[PDB]
């Protein structure tokens, strides 16, 4: 019913005082993490992080681990080059990030493909949407842009994105359909806390929900006032699901006249709640 995505997140960190770098990979299908890699780990491997991926054999695991280990090194090289391009200080730690993956239309084709990079938390370079040009954020990226322009690796990249990534995304979906393809509706309730003798707080609670996106509004008699409600940022539950609340102060004895409205993929129908 919805688009799906396969998505990886690379973080490379230099330790010049140490004189070495650390490399991380995490992979996601939609909101669900399924793999990780860390280069500091003694016999570093790509490692399952959801039950369903474990139904893949060693040959999968060797391949990915092989590639993750090459990545550690090319990335370590990148940090050195980056310093050179930026004429960066010898003793200062620096951060390099890459995120990429696939969105999948119910049309079985790649809706959108993204490959992007940042250096010290600032955008550095990105594959464009047609998946055939780069945007360079500065002069040091222009260099990369010339260097990658020649290597033709946007060819390499569009092919993976339009083929391989789309292909594995689908396989992952079948493997973990009992989890990846089921929305989990939030368990909801309303609490009451007296923020003032004459200032009662109502907090509408939504817990256990997957996937991440949700809508929580508060209304009185068909009237909405989010100018007033306190909303928290959606936060994970710890177990693969998320949690949010939205809260407001109401005049004492007027509780019944407030309705919290909740919209979510997992829900049969949107649910409005009153205190009780």
């Amino acid at each position: 019913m919805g688009p799906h995505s396969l998505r990886y997140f690379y973080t490379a960190v230099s330790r010049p005082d140490r004189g070495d770098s650390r490399f991380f990979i995490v992979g996601y299908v939609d909101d669900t993490q399924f793999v990780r890699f860390d280069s500091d780990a003694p016999n570093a491997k790509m490692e399952p992080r959801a039950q369903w991926i474990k139904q893949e054999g060693p040959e999968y695991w060797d391949r990915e681990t092989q590639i993750s280990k090459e990545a550690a090194q090319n990335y370590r090289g990148s940090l050195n080059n980056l310093r050179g391009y930026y004429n960066q200080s010898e003793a200062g730690s620096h951060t390099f990030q890459n995120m990429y993956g696939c969105y999948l239309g119910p049309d079985g084709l790649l809706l959108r493909g993204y490959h992007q990079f940042a250096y010290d938390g600032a955008d550095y370079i990105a594959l464009n949407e047609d998946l055939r040009s780069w945007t360079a954020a500065d002069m040091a990226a222009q260099i990369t842009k010339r260097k990658w322009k020649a290597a033709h690796e946007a060819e390499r990249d569009r092919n993976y994105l339009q083929g391989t990534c789309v292909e594995w995304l689908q396989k992952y979906l079948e493997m973990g359909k009992d989890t990846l393809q089921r929305a989990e509706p939030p368990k909801t309730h309303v609490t009451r806390h007296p923020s003032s003798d004459l200032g009662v707080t109502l907090r509408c609670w939504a817990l256990g929900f997957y996937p991440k996106e949700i809508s929580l509004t508060w209304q009185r008699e068909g009237q909405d006032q989010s100018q007033d409600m306190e909303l928290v940022e959606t936060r994970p539950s710890g177990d693969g699901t998320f949690q949010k609340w939205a809260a407001l102060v109401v005049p004492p004895g007027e509780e019944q006249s407030y309705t919290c409205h909740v919209q979510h993929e997992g829900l049969q129908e949107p649910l409005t709640l009153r205190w009780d």
């Binding site: 990979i25 090459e70 260097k147 990658w148």
Partner: peptide, 9 residues
């Protein structure tokens, strides 16, 4: 499935 990159910046 991981993308493989042979080239540094």
């Amino acid at each position: 499935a991981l993308l493989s990159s042979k080239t540094s910046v």
